[PDB]
Amino acid sequence: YPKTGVATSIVEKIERAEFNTAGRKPTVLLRIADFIAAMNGMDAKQDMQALWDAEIAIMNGRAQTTIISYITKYRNAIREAFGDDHPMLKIATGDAAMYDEARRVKMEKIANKHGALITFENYRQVLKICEDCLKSSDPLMIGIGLIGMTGRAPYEVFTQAEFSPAPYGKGVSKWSILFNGQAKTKQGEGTKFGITYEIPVLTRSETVLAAYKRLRESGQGKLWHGMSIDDFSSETRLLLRDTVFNLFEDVWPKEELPKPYGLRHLYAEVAYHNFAPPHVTKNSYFAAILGHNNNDLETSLSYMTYTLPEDRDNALARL
Amino acid sequence: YPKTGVATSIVEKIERAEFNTAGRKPTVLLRIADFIAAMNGMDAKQDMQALWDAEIAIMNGRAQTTIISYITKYRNAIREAFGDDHPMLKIATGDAAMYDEARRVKMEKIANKHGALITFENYRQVLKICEDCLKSSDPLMIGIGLIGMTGRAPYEVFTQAEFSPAPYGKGVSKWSILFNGQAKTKQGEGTKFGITYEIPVLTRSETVLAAYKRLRESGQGKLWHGMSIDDFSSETRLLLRDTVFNLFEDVWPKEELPKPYGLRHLYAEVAYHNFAPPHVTKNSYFAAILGHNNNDLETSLSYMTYTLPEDRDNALARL
DNA sequence: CATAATAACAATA
DNA sequence: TCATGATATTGTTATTATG
DNA sequence: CATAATAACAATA
DNA sequence: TCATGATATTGTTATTATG
Ligand SMILES: [Cl-]
Ligand SMILES: [Cl-]
Ligand code: NA
Ligand code: NA
């Protein structure tokens, strides 16, 4: 328990923002910096409570998810400046009802999607487009194609993925590769953090591996590699978004706009349709190929979004 | 907040047990009765804590699930004698780690089953046997057949089920009926408590309805109707168990012994295989036909236990 | 000289 | 299963009384 | 006289 | 997503500087 410290990343972001040619003012980051600064020398939890109450009063008007995210930012700043043992971490948090309601809403959305799956009629054209993106010389395109083919998250694909040949007996597997660099694990001991596991691919493994080699050895590929989530977001998010919008504009199901992470969802589906052994559930297979926490099947629920046109067809054959 | 009261059901069970021709002594019920008796006049929470600590010390040696169940019994007794506002309800409970570990174990079991589904090779013979049980004159048999065909829980089937014709446009549906009397709802406002909803049946609806009419109008049927869970358990559980063991001894998959609730599991599976529309997930369909809480998909995980031989076959066709 | 009856004991949803 | 701090079911076995 | 750049704002897993 | 009290990602839009 120290009473002194500074949140380096926020301050650096501000000082970096002092040379902005355009864009918003970093007001939130400013408030966080001022918060941490005012925290220095504080010992009375009453004062801490008052401060955090001021901050809470400021965030009034924002959306629930937004407020939650901001709270996450504040807490990470506190951890960065003062450590995990600071008492403010017992004060600077959301009220229980907030997280309860967030959970309720999320589960409601998932439950709604499960009762109204979207028919991905042109999924073959999408997969085709990704496979075409594999051969492009534009690193972004190759990345998108890799999101489509390996089903790895954008951050994983662009910043930290490790793809390698998967041994099939005494040879190399054609329809699967080894992957390392799972994201969002939070370094849980039951997670795939630092674990190399085998995943299926929706095209020949040679093409995937080669394409990833072309991506890594690229200039933008060497710029991307090792990036923090903020760096990657600020650098690529909107461009990737626009490019994805434009690529699949006319083939994506009209119930929704084509977003990058959708390619992950679809992947799972297609993968399950083609490679899943008969002794496993859809939840279990999703959980396996997506690299989820040990013994978890609940996260998989979030990925059941589409239904394949053939499944739709023969589910109408049986009737 | 009163300090006086008696748990009527326990005492009545004891006084009823005073005329036992055979069987164990009601020691647990005795301890609960003595507990409630000693609670009378208690005002100091320290004393309450000491008492419940004595009880906890007694239960040492039992299994975790057992201790949990016993705690449930104690709490229900406290609620019966003193009401929901008694402070002992804040003391007479399990420590958080116990329920955490229970959850962990349960989820681990489910996750294990999801990665090793059992091939129900002879499920057609089982369904056939149930359909045969529908025409029997033995009410128990009819009940079993109804567990197999309607997929309703034993307690529901024998004690409180309300089956009725399901309207299909301007007529009666052949492959579905209306059901009322959902169990285990705990009267949640998002549950099917007191709700009549439509369920699929694995044989013609006429046969089901007729068979249930023959069951209800029976003597044992009129004895069963309206029974508490304890009454039904003590009256029927072991007989139903033995009969179920004997009926499906040679056709049930050899990975497990044939238990009544299995017929529910299987039901779901078969139902999903035959009736599920293409726009819904297996989780959602299970949740729908099993009558689960609103927006819940997690309970359905517990019912994915078997895999049908045809699915096994064509999952090996695709390979 | 042995079996059925009962509730403890236990696991599942 | 409903809620996420537990309860309500379903499943198994030791112990007891009894010509 | 208008567009791109940036971080706020927001939702998903 | 990992844990079940939240965090780490991915997705959207208002605001700002700038010949
Ligand atoms: Cl293909
Ligand atoms: Cl059939
Ligand atoms: Na919301
Ligand atoms: Na256990």
Author numbering:
A (entry chain A), B (entry chain A): 103 to 421
What does the original paper state about this entry?
Hairpin telomeres of bacterial linear chromosomes are generated by a DNA cutting–rejoining enzyme protelomerase. Protelomerase resolves a concatenated dimer of chromosomes as the last step of chromosome replication, converting a palindromic DNA sequence at the junctions between chromosomes into covalently closed hairpins. The protelomerase enzymes function as a dimer, making staggered cleavages of both strands of DNA to form covalent 3′-phosphotyrosine linkages, then exchanging the released 5′-ends while holding onto the 3′-ends, and finally sealing the broken DNA strands to generate two hairpin ends. The TelA monomer consists of two structural domains, the catalytic domain and an α-helical bundle domain, that together clamp down the DNA substrate.
Having revealed the structure of the hairpin telomere, we then asked whether stabilization of the extremely compact DNA hairpin conformation by TelA is dependent on covalent closure of the DNA strand. To address this question, we used TelA with a point mutation in one of the active site residues Arg255 that plays an essential role in coordinating the scissile phosphate. TelA•R255A was crystallized in complex with the palindromic target DNA sequence nicked at the scissile positions (DNAa in Figure S1). The resulting 2.3 Å resolution crystal structure of the TelA•R255A–DNA complex shows the exact same hairpin DNA conformation as observed in the wild-type TelA–hairpin DNA–vanadate complex (r.m.s.d. of 0.41 Å for the six nucleotides in the hairpin), except that the scissile phosphate-binding site is empty and nothing bridges the 5′ and 3′-OH groups of DNA. As the DNA hairpin region is free from crystal lattice contacts, the result suggests that the hairpin conformation observed in our crystal structures is the most thermodynamically preferred conformation of the telomere DNA sequence when bound to TelA, even in the absence of a covalent phosphodiester linkage. This argues against a model in which strand ligation captures the hairpin conformation of an otherwise flexible DNA strand during hairpin telomere formation by TelA.
